[PDB]
Amino acid sequence: GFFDSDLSYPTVRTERMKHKRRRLVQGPNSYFMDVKCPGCKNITVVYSHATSEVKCNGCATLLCRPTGGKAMLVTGCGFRKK
Amino acid sequence: TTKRRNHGRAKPPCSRGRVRPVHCFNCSRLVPKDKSVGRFVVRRMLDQASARDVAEASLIYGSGFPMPKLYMKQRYCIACAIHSRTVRARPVEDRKRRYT
Amino acid sequence: AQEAMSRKEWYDVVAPKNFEVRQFAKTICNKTQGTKIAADFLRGRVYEGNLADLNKTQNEDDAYRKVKFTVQEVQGRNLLTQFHGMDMTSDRVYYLLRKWCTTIEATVEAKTADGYGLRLFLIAFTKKQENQLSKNCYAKTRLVKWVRMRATNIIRRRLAKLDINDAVSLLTRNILRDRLAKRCNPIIPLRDLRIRKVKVIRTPKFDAQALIAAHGEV
Amino acid sequence: VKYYGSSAGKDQLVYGVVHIYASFNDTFVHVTDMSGRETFCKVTGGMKVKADRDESSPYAAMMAAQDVVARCKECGINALHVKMRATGGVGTKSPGPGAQAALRALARAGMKIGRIEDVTPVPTD
RNA sequence: GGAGAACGUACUGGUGCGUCAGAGGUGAAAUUCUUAGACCGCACCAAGACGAACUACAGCGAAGGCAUUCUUCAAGGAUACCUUCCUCAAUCAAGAACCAAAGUGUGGGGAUCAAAGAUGAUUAGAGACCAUUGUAGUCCACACUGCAAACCAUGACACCC
RNA sequence: GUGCCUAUUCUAUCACCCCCGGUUCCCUCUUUUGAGGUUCUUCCGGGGUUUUUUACGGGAAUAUCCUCAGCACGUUUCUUACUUCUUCACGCGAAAGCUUGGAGGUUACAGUCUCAGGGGGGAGUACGUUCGCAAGAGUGAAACUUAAAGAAAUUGACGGA
């Protein structure tokens, strides 16, 4: 079945469900966030998908770990978004 | 003409290229585990009153088994099955659809 | 000829201390005569007494296990024994088995304080939890390896450094079973946990000194 | 009484074990103390009959179980653990026919029961 | 996948006793073992093996093929990312690289299962089924091979239902 | 929402020192030759230190595993397998039967690439020929011969089913 809707337009369900490279157009699924080391009054741009690290440079150390999916934020590092 | 698709073997779709043959403990030509039916069961012991005799003489208690019992890992295939009035052409469709 | 009771005489097998039944069992041996004396070949015999039966006078579910005892001295009819293993049989495992589930088995070797060298074997089975809706609810290789890794650590660590009769006291009351349980629960849980076999690998034989300490007093 | 040591022969439990072995051509009764280093006695259905088509049978077993009980009593093995075994690392862990007849028979023939075992061994082929 | 180690445990063979009038095998028994002493029981060893139920239309693997552990080694996949890189491709004669069983040579290798054979028995015949063993093989080191109802009897790759 | 951290010590505490166990003139009980309990008075004992006992987590340390990293469930996606397979698809098919993205979407005949195939038998064989130690593989006929051979279903017949 396929009537009421539009394939062209999704709506209120209908984006949430499409998967990544079959989102009608793919789009960077991951994103960036802003994170703060309580280590300092200064903060950092971050990948929600990172494969490596963030160092705080209010003190050289790393606030997250490489792990496959969303990277592991940790340690009371606080973040917000774009 | 051909009679039963998977022809016992439960591996065509999947990944188990070739799989465990066994002597079948009752006839004993060597065969793969999924062309033999299994119904590994525990097993009961004594008749009623021989047990009653043994029950009174049950100076035997608990441990997770208050009087114990056997266990037969039973695996039948054509060779033995047959004679043992065990496994054959049912009616059609059940030759494809599993127990409950 | 002589025929058997005429042949054999009768001897009282006795435990070590931490044993509730201590003159616990008996055994018969052939009538001693020139050169041929009874006590010897009995040291080389291994006695199974039920763990419940020995250390409990009653209801206790550890009767599933029996302890191998090899004879260390004969004094009179009676002969004062040591610990060699506490094992079990087939039945337990199989009622306890469930198939379309999962296995974790493990063994460690630890040398006692005693130098009774022991290998110790363990077991436990999956679950679908309360309601792990999942079809048959297993565990990864990582999991199994990791659990073993914790299991093994304790057992050797805890068992290496201990007095044998006391290894027994813990093995009796299965505080050890539970101990494993302590480590095991936050992980993938299974149900169970048992010491399914325990093997005497190595023994440093006797000392009356050691004996009294082990034996205590009858 | 051939009770010739620290009886009182049924007053207290006095355990040996009967290693019961039923092949498919005979059935073996092997009475121990607590390890057969020193074996007491061993009685067969074949010992008790001859037929070449019988001898691991409940009949024979039932018969066998009697003699054993008599000797057993005679020595005073008040109680008795049974370690039944099949033929071995082969057969489906189910011993020869007689095993029940004999077993039942020992209790029937004077044993207070306690502690039964299947002891046939585990193969790698 | 490959190198390790550790073992569980059995099969045996063996020991070590214990005893003992029978064993043992079987369609039917028969060939087997027998009171040196058979079996048997238990202890223990030796040995070579095998990873037992677990564990299943369930995983991994090009395929063949693949199940203790740890110890490793180097490998693979998938999944993840806003990573870079710009067709890189596709499928493919020749041509290469694999291919279970088994065989085959050079060496292990010995335990078992058992082709050869041998025995029974059976038969009408029967050197066949059946039994009782038992020689080659078997496992393996090492080579080599190319044949396997080597079956999702279903080329691949594609895009859909 | 759900289960899930081994064992000691300080503090409001100068605390039974803490924990743990127990008692006839301890405490409670229309019981009374009786029951229960004490980190309730109150006494005594054991343990802490042997707790590496088996028994920790307000604040904190220790011993210390080492996700006592969160793990493990339930509930929710989605990539890839494997589905199975409910169940559906016409469709396709001679059927038998045919999924992931079947043997579907094709004589309404046409995505690519490729292999193979092309009555039957003779023969997959032949001194035909080439690999191959060696099996034998690879490659591969005509003569001669013949009217079928095949396939699925169907019903029937039959069975030492």
CA distance D76 to D73: 5
Residues followed by a break in chain C, C–N over 2.5 Å? none
Phi, psi of C92 (to 5 degrees): -65, -50
Structure tokens at C173: 């009351």
Integer CA distances (angstroms), D85 to C48, D20, D34, D50, D89, in order: 18, 6, 17, 22, 10
Which DSSP letter does residue C133 get?
-
Q: Compute the distance between CA of residue D71 and CA of residue D61 in angstroms, rounded to an integer.
A: 16
How far is it, in rounded angstroms, from Cα B94 to Cα C2?
A: 69
**Beta A78-81 vs A32-36: how paired, if at all?**
antiparallel
Query: Of B2, B5, B8, whose CA–CA distance to B81 is shortest?
Result: B8
The DSSP secondary structure of B26-80, one letter per residue, reads TT--EEEGGGSEEEEEEE--S-HHHHHHHHHSB----SS-SS--EEEEEEE-HHH
Distance of alpha carbon C85 from alpha carbon C107, whole angstroms:
14
Cβ(C192)–Cβ(C123) below 8 Å: yes
Is C56's Cβ below 8 Å from some Cβ in D?
Answer: no
Backbone angles phi, psi at B73, to 5 degrees: -80, 90
* D and B interact (at least 3 Cβ pairs within 8 A): yes
Residues of chain C neighbouring B65 (CB-CB closer than 8 A): 64, 91-92, 95
> CB under 8 Å to D75, separation ≥6 — which residues?
C4, C5, D2, D3, D40
Nearest partner of C26 among C83, C82, C67, C71, judged by Cα: C71
C69 close to C48: Cβ distance less than 8 angstroms: yes
Taking the C-alpha atoms of residue C95 and residue B71, their distance in angstroms, rounded to an integer, is 8
- First-last CA distance in chain B: 30
Distance CA D21, CA D120 (A): 9
Resolution (Å) of this entry? 5.6
Residue matched to tokens 């039945």? C91
Q: Do C48 and D34 touch (CB under 8 A)?
A: yes
Beta strand C66-75 with C46-50: parallel, antiparallel or unpaired?
Answer: antiparallel
Of A51, A56, A52, the closest CA to residue A75 belongs to: A56
The pair of three-digit structure tokens given for residue B55, joined into one six-digit string: 């029950």
| Å from the C154 CA to the F62 C1' | 19
C-alpha to C-alpha distances, D4 to C5, C34, C209, D46, nearest whole angstrom: 6, 20, 34, 30
The torsion region of residue C16 among left (phi > 0), alpha (psi -120 to 50) and beta comes to: beta
The angle at the Cα of C17, spanning C11 to C21, to the nearest 5 degrees, equals: 55
Q: Give residues 136-175 of chain C lying near strand E (Cβ < 7 A).
A: 136, 144-145, 148-149
- Helix-helix angle C175-184:C164-173, to 10 degrees: 70
Q: What subunits make at least 3 CB pairs under 8 angstroms with B?
A: C, D
Nearest CA in chain D to C9: D5
Pull the structure tokens for residue D92. 């489906």
Give Dmax (Cα) for chain A.
58
Structure tokens at D107: 């209790």
Q: Which two tokens stand for residue B7?
A: 């022809």
Asked if A40 and A48 count as a contact pair (C-beta separation under 8 A), the reply is no
- Kindly give the pairing relationship between strand D15-22 and strand B30-32: unpaired
Length of chain C: 218
Q: Is D79 on the interface with C (CB under 8 A)?
A: no
Method: cryo-EM
Instruction: Determine the Cα–Cα distance for residues D85 and B100; give it in Å rounded to an integer.
Output: 34
Whose CA is closest to D68, among D26, D116, D124, D28? D28
3-class DSSP state for residue C119? strand
Q: Under an 8 A CB cutoff, do C46 and D41 touch?
A: no
| Sign of the dihedral through C-alpha B36, B46, D41, C81 | positive
Reading the block at residue C190, the tokens are: 């299974």
